Design an enzyme around this catalytic site. Structure first.
Site, PDB file in Angstrom:
ATOM      1  N   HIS A  43       0.830  -1.197   0.000  1.00  0.00           N
ATOM      2  CA  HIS A  43       0.000   0.000   0.000  1.00  0.00           C
ATOM      3  C   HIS A  43       0.868   1.252   0.000  1.00  0.00           C
ATOM      4  O   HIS A  43       2.073   1.222   0.281  1.00  0.00           O
ATOM      5  CB  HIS A  43      -1.016  -0.020   1.167  1.00  0.00           C
ATOM      6  CG  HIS A  43      -0.465   0.415   2.491  1.00  0.00           C
ATOM      7  ND1 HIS A  43      -1.175   1.223   3.356  1.00  0.00           N
ATOM      8  CD2 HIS A  43       0.716   0.150   3.101  1.00  0.00           C
ATOM      9  CE1 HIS A  43      -0.455   1.427   4.450  1.00  0.00           C
ATOM     10  NE2 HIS A  43       0.697   0.792   4.318  1.00  0.00           N
ATOM     11  N   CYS A  97       3.790   5.546   5.612  1.00  0.00           N
ATOM     12  CA  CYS A  97       3.887   4.307   6.373  1.00  0.00           C
ATOM     13  C   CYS A  97       5.330   3.816   6.393  1.00  0.00           C
ATOM     14  O   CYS A  97       6.072   4.007   5.425  1.00  0.00           O
ATOM     15  CB  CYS A  97       2.999   3.221   5.740  1.00  0.00           C
ATOM     16  SG  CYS A  97       2.978   1.661   6.562  1.00  0.00           S
ATOM     17  N   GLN A 115      -7.536  -2.909   9.649  1.00  0.00           N
ATOM     18  CA  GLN A 115      -8.741  -2.095   9.780  1.00  0.00           C
ATOM     19  C   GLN A 115      -9.741  -2.495   8.709  1.00  0.00           C
ATOM     20  O   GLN A 115      -9.370  -2.833   7.581  1.00  0.00           O
ATOM     21  CB  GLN A 115      -8.401  -0.609   9.664  1.00  0.00           C
ATOM     22  CG  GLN A 115      -7.414  -0.151  10.736  1.00  0.00           C
ATOM     23  CD  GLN A 115      -7.084   1.323  10.639  1.00  0.00           C
ATOM     24  OE1 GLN A 115      -7.901   2.178  10.943  1.00  0.00           O
ATOM     25  NE2 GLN A 115      -5.883   1.622  10.166  1.00  0.00           N
ATOM     26  N   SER A 138      -6.293   5.563   9.608  1.00  0.00           N
ATOM     27  CA  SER A 138      -4.905   5.987   9.419  1.00  0.00           C
ATOM     28  C   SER A 138      -4.747   7.075   8.367  1.00  0.00           C
ATOM     29  O   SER A 138      -3.810   7.880   8.465  1.00  0.00           O
ATOM     30  CB  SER A 138      -3.991   4.811   9.048  1.00  0.00           C
ATOM     31  OG  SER A 138      -4.236   3.659   9.840  1.00  0.00           O
ATOM     32  N   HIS A 141      -5.471   5.253   1.446  1.00  0.00           N
ATOM     33  CA  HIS A 141      -4.592   4.190   0.938  1.00  0.00           C
ATOM     34  C   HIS A 141      -4.822   3.949  -0.547  1.00  0.00           C
ATOM     35  O   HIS A 141      -5.958   4.021  -1.023  1.00  0.00           O
ATOM     36  CB  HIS A 141      -4.861   2.859   1.647  1.00  0.00           C
ATOM     37  CG  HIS A 141      -4.818   2.914   3.147  1.00  0.00           C
ATOM     38  ND1 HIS A 141      -3.700   2.540   3.864  1.00  0.00           N
ATOM     39  CD2 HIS A 141      -5.724   3.344   4.056  1.00  0.00           C
ATOM     40  CE1 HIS A 141      -3.940   2.687   5.154  1.00  0.00           C
ATOM     41  NE2 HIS A 141      -5.154   3.191   5.297  1.00  0.00           N
TER      42      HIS A 141
HETATM   43  N1  LIG Z   1       0.956   2.022   8.701  1.00  0.00           N
HETATM   44  C1  LIG Z   1      -0.200   1.380   8.349  1.00  0.00           C
HETATM   45  C2  LIG Z   1      -1.420   2.038   8.419  1.00  0.00           C
HETATM   46  C3  LIG Z   1      -2.586   1.391   8.070  1.00  0.00           C
HETATM   47  C4  LIG Z   1      -2.576   0.080   7.630  1.00  0.00           C
HETATM   48  C5  LIG Z   1      -3.856  -0.608   7.242  1.00  0.00           C
HETATM   49  C6  LIG Z   1      -4.619  -1.152   8.440  1.00  0.00           C
HETATM   50  O1  LIG Z   1      -4.209  -0.871   9.574  1.00  0.00           O
HETATM   51  O2  LIG Z   1      -5.596  -1.860   8.224  1.00  0.00           O
HETATM   52  C7  LIG Z   1      -1.356  -0.572   7.554  1.00  0.00           C
HETATM   53  C8  LIG Z   1      -0.183   0.062   7.911  1.00  0.00           C
END
Ligand SMILES: Nc1ccc(CC(=O)O)cc1
Ligand SMILES: [Cl-]
Length: 147
Positions: A43, A97, A115, A138, A141
């Site tokens: 991502h 990230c 998430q 967060s 994405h």
């Molecule tokens: N750093 C980072 C932030 C969000 C996610 C996705 C999730 O947490 O579902 C993955 C890595």
């Protein structure tokens, strides 16, 4: 006969039919190719001022608005789709990230770990397919399903 998640849509500017997925936010001209225990994804994350943790390796204080983050995401998607830029290159340079250091790769995961909007988009992507903008707490994405 359209697969689950997909709907037909109409281009406002051209009138050509296209297809949109409301789980991945992907859109494409062609009729979509009509569940794994695990998927592997990369991502590119763009954080904003309402992110859960408005900080990253790029920027101690992330201040851009959500609308500004969405504009950045949309521009990266255009360059990836045109072939002007590679997903892996944009992720290494611009993802908020820590996985930027690994070209965006998160490794493999099952349901129950990510998430929910991220998990749902990841599992609705076909192998090799890219999402549109996916929103989580967060940030925003771009998700690439690699396995
Ligand atoms: N750093 C980072 C932030 C969000 C996610 C996705 C999730 O947490 O579902 C993955 C890595
Ligand atoms: Cl598949």
């Amino acid at each position: 006969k359209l697969p689950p998640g997909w709907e037909k849509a109409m281009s406002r500017s051209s009138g050509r039919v296209y297809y949109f997925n409301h789980i991945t936010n992907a859109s494409q001209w062609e009729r979509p190719s009509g569940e794994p225990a695990r998927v592997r994804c990369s991502h590119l994350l763009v954080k904003h001022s309402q992110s859960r943790r408005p900080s990253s390796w790029r920027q101690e204080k992330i201040t851009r608005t959500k609308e500004e983050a969405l504009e950045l995401i949309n521009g990266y998607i255009q360059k990836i789709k045109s072939g002007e830029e590679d997903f892996e290159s944009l992720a290494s340079q611009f993802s908020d990230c820590s996985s930027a250091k690994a070209r965006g790769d998160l490794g493999a995961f099952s349901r129950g770990q990510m998430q929910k909007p991220f998990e749902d988009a990841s599992f609705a992507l076909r192998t090799g397919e890219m999402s549109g903008p996916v929103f989580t707490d967060s940030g925003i994405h771009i998700i690439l399903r690699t396995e």
